[PDB]
């Protein structure tokens with residue numbers, strides 16, 4: 001079983017990694033084993049003097065703080081977003097663009113970006129007067145919480161994976177991680193995409209053919225959109241993966257809708273299992289959210305992401321074909 | 325009590341004897357001043373607030389201001405409440421704000437510094453505090469003041485909004501959050517820039533503010549002006565506020581020094597210039613803000629601006 005797991009982890013640089021198989025083969029530790037593999041692949045332990053036992057201890061505690069009883073926003077989703085960000089960071093158009101600290105920030109942000117997610121939306125938490133919404137003043141409620149948990153866990157016994165960074169490195173990393181995770185709030189998507197489109201329309205490329213990003217605002221914007229794309233990457237994956245993600249998000253949505261129905265609340269979009277169209281909802285998700293975003297990312301890194309965009313378009317056609 | 329009632333008759337006047345009221349009321353200036361203002365504005369009947377619920381909430385809220393913090397305590401909260409109350413009555417703002425917007429501005433003022441520990445956001449961030457960890461370094465104190473102020477409504481017989489409709493509670497909550505978050509001093513320059521832009525594009529008959537974006541911006545700047553109103557008050561009050569903020573700053577500097585931290589501006593008691601700092605505070609923060617406010621409400625802010633300019637002249641004269 002360990003041999004099979006190691007073989008599967010050889011695919012860590014590939015879009016379409018068998019992340020559900022890795023979750024089972026690793027004993028429900030996909031986030032730990034995928035993060036560890038990526039840190040080794042990128043030489044991050046040596047670069048940042050991260051003791052291996054500290055990394056494993058932190059990763060296992062972080063993974064434990066994802067809810068094993070939530071169908072979508074669990075440790076498998078976190079592992080998938082980590083690995084997807086890892087692939088996007090390796091795109092030819094970004095070669096030598098980001099520092100080791102920025103790479104570390106994007107990967108760490110991906111790992112923590114949904115930690116302790118309860119399986120219900122920000123709006124549900126606001127409308128039910130939850131403790132989380134009271135703590136965070138209705139403003140990026142979940143995303144503020146994910147950050148606070150992900151950072152607080154570094155303070156547990158033998159968990160400070162950043163113990164050997166300089167003070168300036170720790171300060172810079174913390175700010176970048178906050179900026180990245182807060183950009184995963186879906187209420188920020190339209191403004192984030194509008195800004196990415198502006199960057200594409202005005203993009204500068206160096207003599208080596210890579211993106212020129214010469215200020216913090218542009219650098220963090222690219223990292224924010226990269227992790228947002230990874231977060232919204234399910235419809236761009238091979239169909240057998242995509243369909244499993246759809247099954248999982250629908251289960252989580254339907255459970256939220258059942259709670260809304262019981263409380264006499266209006267049921268959130270796509271959350272009413274008695275009036276659902278799973279297939280039309282995927283086509284709409286792609287047409288209005290995922291394709292606009294991925295077509296723009298593909299333009300930023302053209303032509304690096306053409307195969308990913310082609311898969312997204314094929315999957316849209318497939319879901320559309322099930323409707324009639 | 326008879327003296328206390330006499331002092332509270334000035335509740336509509338800039339320059340209320342708020343320290344006297346704090347003394348006369350047994351250190352309950354926030355409770356007695358809020359109660360008086362809710363009566364003056366008929367807010368208890370308008371929003372069907374039971375008087376015992378109002379008093380219970382106000383005393384609980386006031387208890388969560390720290391009595392051992394020299395500036396950011398219940399007296400400051402009462403002063404900001406009363407200052408906002410006066411600014412809401414500016415003639416140029418006649419007919420601008422609804423009763424719910426008035427309630428939101430007053431409630432926001434009352435809670436806007438609750439549970440303040442007497443140290444800055446930057447101190448909380450640099451000391452890796454629990455507050456900064458909770459709030460991701462962003463408007464750390466202001467998010468906490470809101471969370472405490474709202475959480476206390478859930479204590480026994482404390483829900484003063486129990487008889488507001490569902491939509492009214494939702495709208496009030498949003499407005500209160502928007503106002504208190506705008507009291508973060510790191511937002512001052514953006515707030516002032518937008519206030520200036522409103523002045524440049526202003527329409528009047530008296531101000532006409534059709535868009536909610538514009539109205540909330542005025543309420544944000546209004547409570548921000550009230551928060552930054554000490555140098556516009558009669559000098560005897562202003563000097564007490566200066567003594568208190570300097571004591572609070574110096575204690576933060578003492579903690580920073582004992583920890584071996586870099587001492588924050590104005591916080592080093594061994595290298596302070598209290599009077600030069602007041603003149604700079606007026607010249608760079610308070611006068612630019614209040615002059616822009618005065619333009620927005622031209623000419624209704626003239627007496628307040630006159631007091632600020634007199635006080636700046638006096639503090640400058642104390643510098644040899």
Ligand SMILES: COc1cc2c(cc1OC)[C@H](CCc1c[nH]c3cc(F)ccc13)N(C=O)CC2
Nearest residue numbers: 186234235245246249270281282284285288289
């Ligand atoms: C595999 O499929 C999904 C995956 C995910 C979602 C929805 C999916 O499928 C409809 C939602 C998107 C939220 C959202 C905001 N506006 C929308 C508008 C839409 F039309 C659809 C979704 C959204 N997520 C979390 O909750 C992320 C993962």
Ligand SMILES: COc1cc2c(cc1OC)[C@H](CCc1c[nH]c3cc(F)ccc13)N(C=O)CC2
Nearest residue numbers: 509554555565566569590601602604605608609
């Ligand atoms: C009575 O006097 C005061 C009262 C208050 C302050 C400073 C006072 O006096 C120097 C500071 C202003 C913060 C601040 C931000 N940038 C600044 C730039 C400056 F030049 C001065 C202050 C500030 N406050 C809270 O901390 C509000 C109350």
Ligand SMILES: [Mg+2]
Nearest residue numbers: 113114142184
């Ligand atoms: Mg999320």
Ligand SMILES: [Mg+2]
Nearest residue numbers: 436437465507
């Ligand atoms: Mg404050």
Ligand SMILES: [Zn+2]
Nearest residue numbers: 077113114231
């Ligand atoms: Zn996510």
Ligand SMILES: [Zn+2]
Nearest residue numbers: 400436437551
């Ligand atoms: Zn204040």
